[PDB]
Every structure is written in C-alpha cells, then in structure tokens.
Amino acid sequence: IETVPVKLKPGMDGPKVKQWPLTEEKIKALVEICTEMEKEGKISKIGPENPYNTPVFAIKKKDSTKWRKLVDFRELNKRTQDFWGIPHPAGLKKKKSVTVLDVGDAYFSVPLDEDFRKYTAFTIPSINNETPGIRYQYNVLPQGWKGSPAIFQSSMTKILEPFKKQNPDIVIYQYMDDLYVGSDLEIGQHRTKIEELRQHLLRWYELHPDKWTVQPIVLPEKDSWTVNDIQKLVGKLNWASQIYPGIKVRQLSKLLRGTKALTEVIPLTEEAELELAENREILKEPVHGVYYDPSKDLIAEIQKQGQGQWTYQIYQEPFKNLKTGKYARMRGAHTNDVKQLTEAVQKITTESIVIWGKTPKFKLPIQKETWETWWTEYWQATWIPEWEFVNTPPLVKLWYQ
Amino acid sequence: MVPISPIETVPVKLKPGMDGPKVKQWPLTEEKIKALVEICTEMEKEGKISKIGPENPYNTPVFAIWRKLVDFRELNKRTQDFWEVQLGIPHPAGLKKKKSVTVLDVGDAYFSVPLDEDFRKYTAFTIPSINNETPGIRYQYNVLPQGWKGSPAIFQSSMTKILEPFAAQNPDIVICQYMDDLYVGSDLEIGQHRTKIEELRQHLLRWGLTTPDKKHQKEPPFLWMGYELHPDKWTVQPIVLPEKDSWTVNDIQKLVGKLNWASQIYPGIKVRQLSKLLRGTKALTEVIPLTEEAELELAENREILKEPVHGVYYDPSKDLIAEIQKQGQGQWTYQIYQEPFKNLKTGKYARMRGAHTNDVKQLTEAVQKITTESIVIWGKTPKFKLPIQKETWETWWTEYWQATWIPEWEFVNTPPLVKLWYQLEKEPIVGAETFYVDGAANRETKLGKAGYVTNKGRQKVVPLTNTTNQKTELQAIYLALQDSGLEVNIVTDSQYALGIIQAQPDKSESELVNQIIEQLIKKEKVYLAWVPAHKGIGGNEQVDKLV
Ligand SMILES: *CC(=O)N(C)c1cc(Oc2ccccc2OCCn2ccc(=O)[nH]c2=O)c(C)c2cc(C#N)ccc12
Predict the structure, then answer these.
(1) Could you give the C-alpha distances from B315 to A125, B94, B104, in angstroms and in order?
(2) Smallest CA separation from ligand 1 atom 11, residue
(3) Neighbour tally for B50: CB within 10 Å
(4) Where is this motif: Tryptophan repeat motif (chain A)?
(5) Is A57 exposed, middle or buried (0-12, 13-18, 19+ CB in 10 A)?
(6) How many angstroms separate the Cα of B31 from the Cα of each of A32, A63, B35, B124, B453?
(7) Which residue in chain A is spatially nearest to B539 when comparing CA positions?
(8) Total structural domains in chain A?
C-alpha cells in the first residue's frame, strides 16, 4: 500500500532489449491478457518517451490450457540494484519431499515505485512490423523481476507466520514467484497439507530430493575383456585420474602391449586385477576438496546420450562436481530433441534453486540458431537462466554413460 | 467555431547531465534574411512558432534553401532517446489483399501536434538582422519541428491514439500509418468504402486535422521502398543488370545488391562468386577481374531476370508452404507459397563461415532462418518441403551428438538430395584389420612422420615436410583408410582428429580432411576408437613416428 524506493546500479541505464518475433496466437493471447491487466490497473499504456524495453512471450503451464504471460527480465534483473540477505535453507535439499507453488499473483497487490516503472516497459509486437507495437509498463510488482520477492518479503513473512508457527518441521523457501515447501510426510498428507497452505494463502508439482543422490564413477565388471574393452577402460580411468589422484593405469596398459585385433579376448594378469580393484576402491570415495563458493557462478553441462537419455554435471571448478545426474524422463517429447533439452534445463535449474538458491549457467549441446528458435515453445518456468553453446563434441560424453 | 479537441502533449526531456543547444547563428544574406522574415511571420501567424525575449540562452542555426531549414543536429545530440517509430520494414508478401485501398494525406497534421511547453525553449532560433544593426528576431517552436529527433515518434503515437477509437469501432476496415500518409483498405463495396473514408476525414477533423479533398497523387501501382504494389500482386521495381566490359568494386557491390534485392521474388538467384570477388578488398575504386564461375553465375542470373516475376499477397485461410532446394557450394534457395506456381516470396541462404560442414546442418540452419522470417512476416511457421528422406533425417538426429529439430515437413524428390555420406560403427568390427595410427612433427624444422601398424603385421611410416602434429595425425588416419579393406578398425590418440570426424563433415577447408571423407565414403564399415597417448598402450607407437 506504500511504495518502496527502487533504483538501478550506478552508471547503468535501463534495459533496451529487442523483442523477438511471436506467432499470431501468442500475440492474440498477450493482447487478451494485457487488456485484462490494464482493466485491473496492473499495467498502463506508455508513450514514445519511454525508450526501454524487455522481451515478452506467452506459454502454457502444466495441466492448463490457459495462456500465461512470460516476461524475460534477465537484463533488468542484472541491471537492478542488489537487494538485501537471508541465508539459503541448507535443510531444504535434505527434506523428503518439496512442493513448488506459484505465488506470483500476490505481487500484483503491491504498487511499484513511481520513478522505476518506466524500466519495466515491454512491447506486444505486430505481425509484419506494421506498427511499433503495443507498449505497456507495470504499475505493480511484476512477475519475474528480482525486486518483487525482495519487496514482498515482509508481507510474505506476515502471511506465513501462523503456518510456520504451527508446523516447525516444514521448511519454506522462496525464489522469484515460486514457494518451495519441504516436509517428510506421506504423499497424501503432503497433498492435504499443500491444500491447507494454498487455502491459507487464498484468504489473505511433486518433487522428492531424498530420491536424488550424487552419481559415482563406475567401471565395468566382466569375465572376459577384449582389446577394445580394455582400451575404453584405460581411457575412462585416465579421464578419472584428473578427478581422483591415485588412479593408476600402467598395469592395465601393459596388457595392451602388441598390435592386437580389437575384438581379441585378453585375460587379465593378477597385477591388472589388483590395479583395477584399487581403482574401484579409490572411485568409491568422494572427491577431495569439493566446496561451494556463493561468490562464484554455477556451471551446468548437459550431454545428449541418445534414446531420450541426458546426463548433466553442476560444478564451479573443473573436475570438482557439486552435483551430477541423469535425466531420462519421457513426457511427450519422444520425437523432439529440443523439447527434451528444454525440459532438462528446467529440471536442472529447479534442482539448483533447491540446493543453492540460484540458477546455473548452462553449456548446451545445440546450435545457437536452433535453440534460440525453439526454446520458448517448450518453456514452462517463471525464471530463465543463462546459457552458452558448445559446438565441438566433447570426448567425455561416453564417460558419463 | 466548432471546438477542437486538444492533442495530449508528450513530456520530453534532455539526456541526463546535458544542457540545451547554444550554436552561433551563421551570417545570412539580406535576401535570405528577408525570405526568412516573411516565412517566419506567416508561421507565427499560423501558430507554429512564437517570439521570445532575451532571457532564452539557447539557439539553433537557421538556413534558407525560399524555404526555411533549421539544423537541429545539436539538439538531436542532446535530446533523450525515444521508442522507435518502426522495428522493421513491412514485407509486401505479408499484406492481405483488399478490394479498395485509399490514401489520405495527413501531412498538415505534422504541424498541428503541440510540443511539450517545458521543452519549447530548447528549440529557440534567431533570424539575423539586416546589416546586424538591430537584435535578431527570436523564435521558438510550439509544435513538432521537422528535423527534430522526437517528431516522427510523437507524431505517430499521437496519430495512433487519435485513430484508435475509429479503428476499434470499424473492424471491417484496415488503417495503416506510414510517415505523413494513411492507408485505408477494405473489402466493402466501393460506395461504403468511400463513405467510411469520409467518416475518417470527419473523425480526424474533430481534432482540427485536415485531409485534402484534392484527388491524391499516390495511385496504383504504388512504388515504395524498391517495391511495386499492385491491386492483386507485388514485385520488386525493375532490376536491370548492366552490361560492363570491365567491373569495378562499386559495380560488383551494385550488382550483388541488385541480386540480393531481386532474390526475394526471383527464384534461383546466386551471389556466391560475385560476392567472393569482394573478399578483403576494402577499396571502392579497385578493378577486379571476373572469374569464369562469376561469368556462368552472372549468365544464369541474366537468364532468371529476363522477364518479370510477381508475388501474390497473403491469404490467411490457406496453408503456408516453404520448399527448399540445394544449389551447391553452400548455396540454398527456397520458395514460400500457398498455391502451387504462385509464390508469396522467394529467398536464399548461404552457409556460415566454418572449417567443416555438411549438407544436413546447412539445411537445418536454412529451415531455422525461413521459420524466423515466416513468423516475422505472417506470424506462423510454414509447412516445409525438403530434399531429404525421412529415414535420412531420422538416422541423423538420432545419432547426432547435438540436439536438433526441424518443424513439420515432408520429403520432396528434387535432386540433389541431402544424404548422409558415411556412418561410423558403434562397436569394433569382427574380422576387420585393426590399424593403430600415429603421427608426429617437429615444431622447429616442421618435419614429421605419419603411419600405422596393424594386427596382421602391415606397417607404414611416411616422412613429411612442412607439417604439424595435427596434420600428421590426420595424415596417419588417411593412410590407414588408403591401405585397408572395405571394413577396418582404426585406433588413434588424436583428440583433434576425433573432434573433427565426430562432427560428421562431408566438406572441409582442409584438403586432407576432404581426402579422409572421400576415403570414408568408399568404405563399408569404419570403427574409430580413441586411446590416451603416452600411456604405454602397445600398438599405439609414438616412437615409430618420432624418429
Ligand atoms: C501501411 C504500411 O505500413 N505499408 C507498408 C503500406 C501498405 C500498403 O498496402 C495496404 C495498405 C492498407 C491496407 C492494405 C494494404 O495492402 C494490401 C494489399 N494491397 C496492396 C496494394 C493494393 O493496391 N491493393 C492491395 O490489396 C501500401 C499500398 C503502401 C503504399 C506505400 C506507398 N507509396 C507505402 C506503404 C504502404
């Protein structure tokens, strides 16, 4: 009911990001949505004296046919002054179950600072560039802007005070327009508790981190090794020696002495079995000196393994993985690589939000033009992370398979 | 007098920390001074400007060419940024045919849009006195001056706000603003159309804006931005390729400009060689001889541009189709249409700069470009016709290490067909000879060696001059492909060669890579395995090639 003064970082002007082309149905959807928002005072039309712009598009969330308006506030978010903070709940990732709730509508009840509104300007584009577009700016806290959860944090504490006083065993975290509620109850009790919390918030996504663990490096167990099997084993052990110090391959490379056929069976000497067993024991231990630094970026690498399987690693320093995983879920994307990749990016970003409370920087195995052409067609999340593109096939792919 | 509705003024500011202009007025001739005095007296009588006192410290130079021309370049440098009047040029193929298209001249409204009063003081200018024996006449603008940075955007936004209720209450017509002209199209009967035109003239007159009753100057065919717009079709303005005994750089840039411009409706335009002659020149007057490939390409262009071709307008009730053909040397051409033999538009795509490539990647990129262009012009993705088999694409994207996707498409049998030229095995081949390859080079003398040893006792080492490590590794793989049967296993330690081959190129800048590709095409089965170097893996002989 009272505006809090907000401004940008020193020396930085507002965002001026080109609006990318939209299909006709997304444009019409945005016209309906923005007309309804203008009737509710949430947004207002602006004149040509506003030079700033932030891209907008439209999506369709899970289990819903209604269109939703998505604003890409990444540039404004990095150009907005730092707000201050709350330490990340390290116990949220340890909880048995976590549920994500969209609390974005609550931001629209708090007005936005007068002098800052011009920086939230966005454009509904026109087909064939016939008009300069329908221009709007926000009058309330917009969804996707980092200042919205920071400004609303006091009100959110006031609303969640009775529930947090009633259940001290439930962990509550907030990130952007999402509320993460972790507990250890049964799925039915968890759903009834989620309905209890949503009806609690009304009058004012099943996720199980316990079923997730870090993935160790495994070596094959065979009774007969071919030359090719041993060559691949030596390669993988040599790659793992960059992570684990004491990895030793000379006794296994001894067996490859001579120019033999790739399919020829080679029996393992006793020294080679001992070396391989020592390597297994070394791989069973965690990596030495692995810590998280909140001042550094999180980097996520994804590899396409084929047959709908994807691998990923989150790290800050090379060979110091903070998280590894394998997303093989099949959900209506059996014939679309890009949809699978987009879903994997969203899942990895969610896990990174749960663990560290921020989003990672992705390295995507895809050409820039394909990704930038198609990723908004399958995006369902409120936030958007940063990404770069790798054009050279990494050799380590099969070593994560 | 009927009361005129006031036009809402746009608040304008200067750039932060800057101040208004203060430019010295040029001395003018007595004749020019008298002319500017008459013109400015008439304009003051009309209300465009107003006289000001000596308190205004700002000044903008004024000229006469009479005609008054104020040079606002300094005030433009000091004026805030505005939202663009346009985010792009409309394309004729996106226009929807109309029974009637009328043109209204709203130029007289340009001077009827008021200027923000707090900003008027920055538009001050001075008419010099005769013999400079009296103080010059001081004026300031009350409306949007021609040449000022914010006049087009404020004028367009004001006109849009004025036209919004008329366009809303008349959804059966189409109103388009372009500079100082309005275009009103409709499928209504000609009488009803002219009627609603009169209604628009009245609605505009309620703000005091005057549309001329005079028969307009613009009429079919509309000539606009190098385009001809007809009632039922569109094309580019006539493209004439000049006959030149010798061609300079600006003649080749004019020719590649005419060909790029003509390529949006004339199918099959190629610009590879002619634009290849402009490589790293940076000399506008330099004369460059024509290669024979440029002559054949230019002859094909003259054959394509011999008689006029037209495009049709967009009909949203029909499907949108885009067909692609490969032209060779990284060139691709495409046609977008809704009815066969009646193109909406055409175009081309040239492969990006790269060391290695294949046809499938280029077809993919072309599909992405056509998709983006089509969403711009028509707001939807077209159905594609591609010269590639379904099984080919499925094999490619299922085995490709990158994620890739092409939207809805169907196979069209139009050679040359995009195909996969080789496919490496997933497992070692039983019964095939195993070639352990290696190569090495000296960094100073550039002397190297490349070779292989096989499980059957076959061996080869070749000495090389003026080579590198990477070159010797590729050369080793090439030698293994040369001297092996139709099925072969190949063991290397070169992460570089594996990085190249795993990208699956069918063409390269390096002749050695192209030779390796030609060898791979001839084989039946090739399995490429990688091992770490210097790890004592026997067979992999670093010493044989470092001698
Ligand atoms: C307004 C605008 O942005 N442009 C690019 C523009 C459009 C024109 O055509 C037009 C205006 C209003 C409604 C419909 C159409 O075109 C539909 C197709 N069509 C074109 C020509 C015709 O005779 N009949 C048709 O059905 C025109 C004509 C322009 C002309 C000029 C000029 N000079 C500039 C811009 C436009």
Answers:
(1) 21, 9, 25
(2) B183
(3) 13
(4) 371-387
(5) buried
(6) 60, 78, 6, 22, 96
(7) A259
(8) 4
The token duo for B58 is 């700002």
Which pair of structure tokens corresponds to residue B382? 């077209």
The CATH number that applies at residue A66 is 3.10.10.10
Pairing verdict, β B383-386 and B321-328: parallel
Helix axes of B390-399 and B359-378: crossing angle, nearest 10 degrees? 100
Q: Which two tokens stand for residue A206?
A: 């099943």
Cβ–Cβ below 8 Å for A128 and B378:
yes
| B261 vs A369: CA distance, rounded Å | 24
- Determine contact: B538 vs chain A, CB below 8 A: yes
Q: A375 and A399: one domain?
A: yes
- Of A135, A369, A397, nearest to B365 by CB-CB distance is A369
Q: Between chains, do B405 and A258 touch, taking CB under 8 Å as contact?
A: no
Mutant choice from A231, A343, A376, A395 vs B, greatest count of B C-beta within 10 A? A231
CA–CA separation, B320 and B332 (whole Å): 19
Contacts of B153 in chain A (CB under 8 A): 48, 132
Most ligand 1 atoms within 8 A of CB, residue of B91, B176, B223 to mutate: B176
Residues A148, A11, single domain; the answer is yes
Contact in structure between B441 and B461 (CB atoms under 8 Å):
no
Three-state SS for A238?
A: helix
> What angle is formed at CA B513 by the lines to CA B509 and CA B517, rounded to 5 degrees?
115
Tell me how crowded residue A116 is: count the other CB atoms within 10 A of its CB.
20
Flag whether A102 is marked binding.
yes
Judge residue B453's burial from the number of C-beta atoms within 10 Å of its C-beta, 0-12 exposed, 13-18 middle, 19 or more buried.
Answer: buried
Tell me how far apart the alpha carbons of residues B135 and B52 are, in angstroms, rounded to a whole number.
12
Provide Rg for chain A, Cα atoms.
25
Is the same domain home to A146 and A102? Answer: no
Residue whose CB lies within 8 A of the most ligand 1 atoms, among B95, B97, B313, B315, for a mutation test = B95
Indicate whether A225 and A264 sit together in one domain: yes
Q: Are residues A269 and A231 part of one domain?
A: yes
With a 6 A CB cut-off, is B90 part of the ligand 1 pocket? Answer: yes
DSSP B341: T
Domain housing A148: 5-90+116-156
**Is-contact B476 B461, C-beta < 8 A?**
no
What is the secondary structure of B216-259 as a DSSP string? PS--SSEEETTEEE-SS-EEESP------SS-BHHHHHHHHHHH
Would you say A57 and A376 are in contact if contact means Cβ atoms under 8 Å apart? Answer: yes
Q: Of A382, A305, A369, nearest to A145 (Cα)?
A: A382
Is A248 in the same domain as A127? no
The CATH number of the domain holding residue A379 is 3.30.70.270
Both tokens of A9, joined, read 């970082």
Domains in chain B with CATH codes: 1-85+111-151 (3.10.10.10), 86-110+152-220 (3.30.70.270), 221-314 (3.30.70.270), 315-421 (3.30.70.270), 422-547 (3.30.420.10)
Candidates B319, B312, B351, B310; CA nearest to B333 is B351
Alpha-carbon torsion B227, B228, B230, B233, what sign? Answer: negative
Q: Specify the residue for token string 């995009």.
A: B418
Encode burial over A306-338: b for 16+ CB neighbours within 10 A, e otherwise: eeeebbbbbbbeeeebbbbbebeeeeebeebbb
Is A177 annotated among the ligand-binding residues?
yes
B221 upstream amide cis, omega within 30 of 0: yes
Q: Are residues A58 and A145 in the same domain?
A: yes
Question: Do A147 and A32 fall within a single domain?
Answer: yes
**Residue A171 is inside which H or E element, if any?**
strand A171-175
